[PDB]
Design a protein around this ligand. Structure first.
Ligand SMILES: CC(C)(C)NC(=O)[C@@H]1C[C@@H]2CCCC[C@@H]2CN1C[C@@H](O)[C@H](Cc1ccccc1)NC(=O)[C@H](CC(N)=O)NC(=O)c1ccc2ccccc2n1
Lengths: 99, 99
């Protein structure tokens, strides 16, 4: 598909057995998902952007379906107002920016 | 061009007659540039990112060249750690996300 950028590029994702809306975010190094009770071990991390840093839980090898495309990788869980799909997973679904 | 996402999608921009590096960011509503002297009238604004809200200077109708493509639009100047080109300008240069 082609997604224009007039509106936020939000898509449906499946993670941990749940459907969520998430932002396809070329400016994010990492994938950051709103607080949710994922099972398994995790590592503390701090991630930054405009306004400073937040504390998140780093989960490895998490399966996520993004707009119908399967991916597996690192997902950071913490208090974000928007679920962010970053480049670690955008590459797995073969996403490009075109102009 | 077609830009893949294994690396940050950094391009050269020209703003205020000056060359800078900036990130093409589909997740950003707005464009935020690091502190600089910029010709024009501005007004104070706040904007929020992953780590909270910051104060910025809002400059309207600023000419900016992005990877050789022209845009004229709003630029927010403030203590952003990375120059970010958001959807307000990505739409002007015809950028889309594809997968
Ligand atoms: C630019 C602005 C208009 C303020 N918009 C946003 O910031 C929106 C805010 C939304 C709601 C909060 C949750 C994030 C989303 C997406 N973001 C866009 C979004 O694309 C944002 C843009 C950005 C890039 C780099 C540095 C600063 C800001 N990316 C990020 O916040 C990601 C998050 C992460 N993966 O760790 N940050 C980075 O990838 C990143 C890269 C290099 C850096 C160097 C030093 C310090 C921090 C750095 N952070």
């Amino acid at each position: 598909p082609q997604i224009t950028l007039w509106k936020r590029p939000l898509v449906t994702i499946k993670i941990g057995g749940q459907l969520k809306e998430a932002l396809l975010d070329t400016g994010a190094d990492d994938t950051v998902i709103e607080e949710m009770s994922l099972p398994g071990r995790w590592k503390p991390k701090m991630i930054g952007g405009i306004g400073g840093f937040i504390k998140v839980r780093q989960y490895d090898q998490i399966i996520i379906e993004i707009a119908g495309h399967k991916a597996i990788g690192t997902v950071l869980v913490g208090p974000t107002p928007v679920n962010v799909i970053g480049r670690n997973l955008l590459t797995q679904i073969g996403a490009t920016l075109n102009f």
